[PDB]
Design a binder for this molecule. Structure first.
Ligand code: SB2
Length: 309
């Protein structure tokens, strides 16, 4: 039961997502979040406020935006990338991978420029519109999502940067060619071994630089000698230009990982790239006061951000 609650409000087909039509003939997506109260509990209210403030901060075609601002309204997205990859009947041509990647990276670029790190990018939160174009959601902070975590996150590193999103993006690129996720691990050790088997044994001096003391304790006697595999065997459907980018996105050490601008500028996107995409529709630095926490103090900023009925 969910549709009956909106009969007294305004339409039917983390929270509960359901489809429907708007006041006018527009296909929308309505998310309902109330209990697990959430909007009353100052901790979880701050998390919901963070999502609303983030969605309202951006106004870019590759980032999900609110259509009506607990009930939440956005445009209805046909399907997600996970469903397109995990449905072998639908074929993803290299031309489709190039287009998808260009839009995925543009969305990440928009977040990174505003100082936002997704931290959990996977095909499940890369949504596809009715017009086939890519949109990113769930940038506000199942088992398979741990297959897209950068080595520094697997190693519980506190000083992770926007570069974790590159590794995630690099994982979804190889997944579009292989039609099977790249690093399908079940443990801390086997997830790291699968990564190292493909990328090559990183220097000990580099791992200590991007691991928590406990991750170093787990890996203390865990010394590997594994050589770097040929990328042609790892991702066989990819051409040398696509493999060059994948390898650059999938750098163990984030200090060598290709930046959002550099990947967008790579020859792989030559036929699609326009330098204006790096600057158009960009939001300014996103600021959120995490220090402030109270009952009625949050409900006043809630009505301040919303202007449309
Ligand atoms: C991380 S994975 O479990 C995951 C998380 C959130 C979502 C997810 N969150 C939303 C969604 C809906 C309304 C909002 F106001 C905000 C987010 C959607 C959505 C939006 C429009 N059409 C279809 C679905 N998908 C999907 C997958």
């Amino acid at each position: 039961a969910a549709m009956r609650d909106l009969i007294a409000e305004l339409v039917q087909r983390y929270g509960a997502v359901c489809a429907g039509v708007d006041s006018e003939g527009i296909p929308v997506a309505i998310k309902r979040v109330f209990n697990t109260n959430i909007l009353s509990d100052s901790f979880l209210c701050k998390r919901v406020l963070r999502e609303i403030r983030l969605l309202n901060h951006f106004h870019h075609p590759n980032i999900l935006g609110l259509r009506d601002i607990l009930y939440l309204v956005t445009e209805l997205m046909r399907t997600d990338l996970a469903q397109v990859i995990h449905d072998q009947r639908i074929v993803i041509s290299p031309q489709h991978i190039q287009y998808f990647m260009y839009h995925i990276l543009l969305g990440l670029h928009v977040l990174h420029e505003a100082g936002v790190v997704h931290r959990d990018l996977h095909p499940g939160n890369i949504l596809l519109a009715d017009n086939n174009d890519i949109t990113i959601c769930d940038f506000n902070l199942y088992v398979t999502h741990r297959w897209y975590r950068a080595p520094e996150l697997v190693m519980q590193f506190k000083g992770f940067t926007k570069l974790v999103d590159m590794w995630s993006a690099g994982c979804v690129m190889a997944e579009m060619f292989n039609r099977k996720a790249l690093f399908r691990g079940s443990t801390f050790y086997n997830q790291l071994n699968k990564i190292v088997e493909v990328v090559g044994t990183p220097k000990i001096e580099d791992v200590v630089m991007f691991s928590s003391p406990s991750a170093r304790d787990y890996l203390r006697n865990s010394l590997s000698n594994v050589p770097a595999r040929a990328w042609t065997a790892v991702v066989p459907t990819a051409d040398p230009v696509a493999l060059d980018l994948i390898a650059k996105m999938l750098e163990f050490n984030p200090q060598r990982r290709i930046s959002t601008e550099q990947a967008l500028r790579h020859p792989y996107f030559e036929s699609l790239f326009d330098p204006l995409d790096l600057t158009e529709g960009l939001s300014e630095r996103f600021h959120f006061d995490e220090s402030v926490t109270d009952v009625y103090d949050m409900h006043k900023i809630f009505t301040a951000e919303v202007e449309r009925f």
